[PDB]
Design a protein around this nucleic acid. Structure first.
Ligand SMILES: Nc1ncnc2c1ncn2[C@@H]1O[C@H](COP(=O)(O)OP(=O)(O)O)[C@@H](O)[C@H]1O
Lengths: 96, 97, 444, 85, 109, 96, 80, 109, 96
DNA sequence: CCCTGGAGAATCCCGGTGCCGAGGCCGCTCAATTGGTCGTAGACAGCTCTAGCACCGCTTAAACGCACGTACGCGCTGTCCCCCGCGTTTTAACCGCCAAGGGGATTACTCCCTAGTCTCCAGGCACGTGTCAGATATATACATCCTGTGCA
DNA sequence: GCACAGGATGTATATATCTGACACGTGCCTGGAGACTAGGGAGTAATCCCCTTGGCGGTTAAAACGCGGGGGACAGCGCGTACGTGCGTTTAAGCGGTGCTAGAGCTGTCTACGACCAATTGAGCGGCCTCGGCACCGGGATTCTCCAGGGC
């Protein structure tokens, strides 16, 4: 067995079972979803890095992630993504 | 009886004149009013550096000039000399906006 | 031991005692080689004294060389008429008009050098600094010198860059806000004396320093008329909507950028803010009066003066407030004439004449506090109501004296409207501080 | 109680000015319906740019929009501007 | 002794790996330091976007009378939603095809 | 004998191929073309089959989008036939 | 090898145009589209070969092709 | 003892700041390690590009009969040259104007 | 005394006097040249960092810089810039 | 000049095959837990220079409204040739299979190249300051455009 | 019907003036060079086995070719309409001012909490098998459409 490779496949599958309980997915579709997740990650992280360099900071923070999602996603997606991220950070802070 | 130029000589003269210069072709104060009105809906109590408005005007004028070039090409494609909203819409659709 | 009577070169007129005293003082300034500031109030023949100075300097001294007078545009014709009437031996030219007229003038009269005095305006000086900069100027006169009271202004820089031998400033209010302005004027005058930026250590020392360079003749030597004025402060309280808006402004969708400027107008009328007025009907009926303390007091005050002597002048610093007052006066059906910056000059003069017509039905003349030209002879009025106070007390004094001119007959009552527990109290306190500074320094 | 509006700010971009822009674009004849279309196009473009610039200004916790913020918004759009920093 | 380890994804109530996102940020040369809330926020955003796309694709697959999501279903879901089409405008999806569309002039008169 | 009018079969093909989701270029000719083109940059090059498949996917997507824009230009000229001038106009407006 | 742009045949171009949504095709479209395809392929293959060379590989990988496409602004989901 | 300091730009023969480029690379978070020859290579490439643009702009200034360069000359140089036009295709030069260009149809005949 | 701002103005002026002895440059043209140098630097550095991540390396080297140059620059510029940089690195390594 | 009537294509329903998707197991390496530290960012204070709001005064360039005439957009028509739809024959793509070895991919080892540190010093930046390149004006010289008219 | 003279317009041209930005010179300080150490990244060699490439034969779909005809491109003509040109009038931009703040940037400090580094360990995750339900393939009966002929 060669070197192990990392993919978001199991997490994508868990989300799919949450959304449609009795619907599956094929290998090419999972590869497409993995590529999508990697691309979105790189877009957001690069934008946040540029923000930190512009403001002369050294730490990537939740405020930078929020500004990056406002910059990159359009409209209702930006609103809902901001709400979801804020909820997650609130739960993490209170439940840690 | 008074001397008059044909319909199209003055248009070509204006084309050459404004393709020879580099100044801004839009009035500064009206443009500033428009920019402030647009930013009002995004966030009230907004203040603008004067250099920001100049950069905005530069970008806007460059965008409009490039759009008009493409519009003229589309009008020539349709075997016309007059540019039309159809030409503007086609240019935007092909460019992907 | 100087000129003791009316000079001979000045024909058709005998200068008064204060006129000849000022001329003697200017001659002493010239003899000692010191430039001076002449501030003898608003009516003691300052233009005549300047003309007499130039007439003397040309006649009894042989220097008919170039002389420049800088004036506001509104006074150019007055200056030319006075030059032609009093001392016609001199040769005076005026520079006005557009670019073609300016070029023709410079090619016809200015550059050929057949003139002796030049009467130009501020704008024409800024335009033609290039050609005025060439000449060697024997005498430079700047009228209404408070225009250049501020350093770092283009006119002050340009007037500093000229090549001059003598300088003379005419004003009535040398001190308007702070001693920096007085130093700016004195630094234009004598740059080598007042090169530095800045009651034995104060008041008396300042008087002794200023006295060799200044001369003020209060309008008390003549008097014999003009019964003294009387200022009454009327305190008013916020209406309920005014209180609601005051709280909304202080606590903080309308942009509120200049908080002081929003609190002010709020103390004038809540209707200025968008949407504070009631809905689409847009009627003028008793909800204008009741929503403003100044407006309720004004409605309680105007009819009493009207059944009394009437002829009231109302001053304000906002044309929006002028609009609201015009609507009120239309609804109550008095007579109103309006004058602000947007009024064309012919209409301004027509309104002044119509109100000043010996027996007219006009009742209220509303002016913007700064929209005059120091003229405006509204001497038929009786009561001045200041809707708004200005940071500059000299502006308020000029507004007052537009109705306190030589033709006045009966005493004038000045009603100043102040809101209690607002920023108007601050404004008035600052104005009192500036006025006390001016009185202690210049008046004494 | 006196209301009198002046004009719409999008009308401040005038027909002769749009004609000058079309002349620099190289256009000879212009239809009369072009002006409203151009006004709409300009409004859309400005809205995108200003939204991004305001996002940057908010992240910096400022209330003043700067030329650098405008430049960054344009680089986000893909319209690099040289000459302002 | 040490308490039972609770994953940060469990603490945040997510289904995406917060720790893996944190390691990817640290190893990516994006910035010198990474805050604690950044991985949680990013994982939540990724989860939301993935859920949106999967929901639309599952709806499309059901309208095709299937049960496995294929690239055709993904492409239909992306191109029939305006926000996701604005997000993925420069993206080509393998074996996705194109939306049915014929211009009205080409249809028989 | 039966004969369809000039344009019905084209519409049927349009619907059929817009319904389908498979590649429309022969794989062996495309592979030979790719290797030929690659000879200009390096010699004895070897390819993964996935590489040639991805190249074909990208090429087909680019051509399909180009043909859509070209069709729009032809409709603008009040035509139904597409022409090389339409292809050139589409490329010029795109920025190529 | 030589004469391989002619392997992209006219029926294939017709199929691609029909998926694009065109009904009538001029006879001169085929040479034009072969030229367009050649220039596009040259750009992509050049970038992919640059990546392969830098890695000191003698094989071109789907990763190299994806990287070249992404740098040209033509992201391809479905291969990695 | 000690030797007199020689700048790396002088060592390499470049008119661009090798040390400043090295520091900018190390602070830009591009990688955790930066090689010795990388700043030299990058500074040389930047110098070549700047020299090209300045040569073309000076030629344009000679054509316009001025001895100082302005953004108009920079735009005329960047356009009119295909390589720099591809490089700066999506770039706007402030007050640079546009190329003179009138279509053949629009001319009188 | 205000803060220190860094710019490439000194070196741009040096190259200008080297390539055109009798020619000057205005302040706005200097701004444009400075912005251009910054933009090119950022493009090359970003491409090199992406290359290092792709090959699972940690060091930006002259090989990475050369590959980024060939990827970003179009053709004649690419080969001339490669020759220039090779000259520079050879000169630096030879006796320095 | 739309209504039946044939034909062709497509759709739906029903039954047999195969192939991987989804589950269950194993092993490992990577994230979570504690503990300690340090440096980054938040908070405060003190200067300086810009931007917003409400006005005024003046000059003048540009927008604006209007009217006329003229290219031009647009519809319509006729012609011709070109692209499409169909049938026949050829060709090479596809698929399955086999075979060989080139190169991708991993591991172990060692060295050398870079990060970090401390001095030392000079190159680059802010600051003043003069002079000259370009903008502008003015008066010509010339090149262009348009019309009327003389000549077939 | 065409071609030219000439008038009027606009434009290119040489000269003279003036001003404000370019370019140079200066002090100093902050960042770059010199010299060293220490450690981990990467170059280098060697092994494995996967995946590429080459070849061959049989099938059959797909390409190439040729025919015949209707529809679409395209040239030409006529018209009336909306845009260009020019002129007189109006408006608002632009410049120069008041008067007061607050906002934001550079300086300089202080300080505390949040991120980093390190050491353990055990649970989550990736790879490997295995099996059955879905997807695919065919087949048959069905519905919708498209084209043609004429009694509507
Ligand atoms: N014949 C006159 N001689 C001198 N002064 C006069 C004469 N007539 C009027 N005045 C004064 O002129 C004043 C108004 O004119 P003003 O513009 O102030 O002139 P000045 O600027 O010369 O004082 C009045 O107060 C009046 O006293």
């Amino acid at each position: 067995r060669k070197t192990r490779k990392e993919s978001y496949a199991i997490y994508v599958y868990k989300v799919l079972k949450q959304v449609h309980p009795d619907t599956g997915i094929s290998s090419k579709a999972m590869s497409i979803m993995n590529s999508f997740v990697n691309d979105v990650f790189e877009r957001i992280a690069g934008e946040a890095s540029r923000l930190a360099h512009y403001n002369k900071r050294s730490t990537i923070t939740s405020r930078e992630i929020q500004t990056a999602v406002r910059l990159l996603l359009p409209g209702e997606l930006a609103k809902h993504a901001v709400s979801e991220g804020t909820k997650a950070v609130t739960k993490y802070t209170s439940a840690k | 009886k008074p001397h008059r130029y044909r319909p199209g000589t003055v248009a070509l003269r204006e084309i050459r004149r404004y393709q020879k210069s580099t100044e801004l072709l839009i009035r500064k104060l009206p443009f500033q009013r428009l920019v402030r009105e647009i930013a009002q809906d995004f966030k009230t109590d907004l203040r603008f550096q004067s250099s920001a408005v100049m950069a905005l005007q530069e970008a806007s004028e460059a965008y409009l000039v490039g759009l008009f070039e493409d519009t003229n090409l589309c009008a020539i494609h349709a075997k016309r000399v007059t540019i039309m909203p159809k030409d503007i819409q086609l240019a935007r659709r092909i460019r992907g906006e | 031991t100087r000129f003791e009577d009316s000079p001979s070169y000045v024909k058709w007129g005998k200068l008064r005692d204060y006129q000849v005293r000022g001329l003697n003082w200017l001659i002493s300034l010239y003899e000692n080689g010191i430039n001076g500031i002449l501030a003898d109030e608003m009516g003691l023949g300052k233009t005549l004294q300047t003309i007499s100075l130039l007439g003397y300097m040309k006649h009894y001294r042989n220097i008919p060389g170039p002389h420049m007078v800088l004036v506001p545009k509104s006074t150019l014709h007055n200056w030319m008429s006075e030059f032609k009437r009093w001392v016609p031996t001199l040769r005076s030219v005026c520079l006005i008009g557009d670019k073609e007229q300016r070029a023709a003038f410079v090619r016809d009269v200015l550059l050929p050098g057949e003139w002796d005095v030049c009467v130009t305006s501020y704008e024409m000086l800024i335009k033609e600094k290039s050609v005025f900069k060439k000449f060697n100027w024997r005498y430079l006169v700047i009228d209404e010198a408070h225009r250049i009271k501020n350093e770092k202004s283009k006119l002050s820089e340009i007037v500093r860059e000229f090549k001059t031998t003598n300088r003379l400033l005419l004003t009535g209010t040398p001190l308007q806000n702070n001693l920096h302005e007085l130093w700016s004027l004195l630094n234009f005058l004598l740059p080598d004396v007042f090169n530095s930026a800045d009651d034995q250590k104060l008041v008396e020392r300042l008087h002794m320093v200023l006295r060799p360079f200044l001369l003020r003749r209060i309008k008390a030597d003549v008097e014999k008329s003009l019964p003294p004025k009387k200022e009454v402060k009327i305190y008013v309280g916020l209406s309920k909507m005014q209180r609601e808006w005051y709280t909304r402004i202080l606590m903080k969708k309308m942009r509120l950028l200049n908080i002081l400027m929003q609190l002010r107008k709020c103390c004038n009328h809540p209707y200025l803010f968008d949407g504070a007025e009631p809905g689409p009907p847009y009627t003028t009926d008793m909800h204008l009066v009741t929503n403003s303390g100044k407006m309720v007091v004004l409605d309680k005050l105007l009819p009493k003066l009207k059944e009394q002597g009437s002829r009231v002048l109302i001053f304000s610093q906002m044309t929006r407030v002028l609009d609201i007052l015009e609507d009120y006066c239309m609804w109550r059906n008095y007579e109103y004439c309006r004058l602000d910056g947007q009024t064309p000059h012919d209409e301004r003069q027509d309104s002044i004449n119509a109100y000043n017509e010996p027996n007219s039905t006009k009742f209220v003349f509303m002016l913007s506090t700064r929209a005059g030209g120091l003229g405006i002879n509204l001497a038929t009025a009786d009561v001045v109501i200041l809707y708004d106070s200005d940071w500059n007390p000299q502006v308020d004094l000029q507004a007052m004296d537009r109705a306190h001119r030589i033709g006045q007959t009966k005493t004038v009552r000045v009603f100043r409207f102040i809101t209690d527990n607002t920023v108007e109290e601050r404004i008035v306190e600052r104005a009192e501080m500036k006025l006390r500074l001016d009185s202690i320094v210049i008046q004494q | 109680r006196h209301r009198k509006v002046l004009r719409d700010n999008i009308q401040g971009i005038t027909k002769p000015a749009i004609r000058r822009l079309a002349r620099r674009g190289g256009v000879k004849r212009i239809s009369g319906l072009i002006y409203e279309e151009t006004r709409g196009v300009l409004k859309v473009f400005l809205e995108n740019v200003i939204r991004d610039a305001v996002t940057y200004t908010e992240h910096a916790k400022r209330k003043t929009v700067t030329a650098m913020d405008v430049v960054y918004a344009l680089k986000r759009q893909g319209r690099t501007l040289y000459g302002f920093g | 002794t040490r308490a039972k380890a609770k994953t940060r994804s469990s603490r945040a109530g997510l289904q995406f790996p917060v720790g893996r996102v944190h390691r990817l940020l640290r190893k990516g040369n994006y910035a010198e330091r990474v805050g604690a809330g950044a991985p949680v926020y990013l994982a939540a955003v990724l989860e939301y976007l993935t859920a949106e796309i999967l929901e639309l694709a599952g709806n499309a697959a059901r309208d095709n009378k299937k049960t496995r999501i294929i690239p055709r279903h993904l492409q239909l879901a992306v191109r029939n939603d305006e926000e996701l089409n604005k997000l993925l405008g420069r993206v080509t999806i393998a074996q996705g095809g194109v939306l049915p569309n014929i211009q009205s002039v080409l249809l028989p008169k």
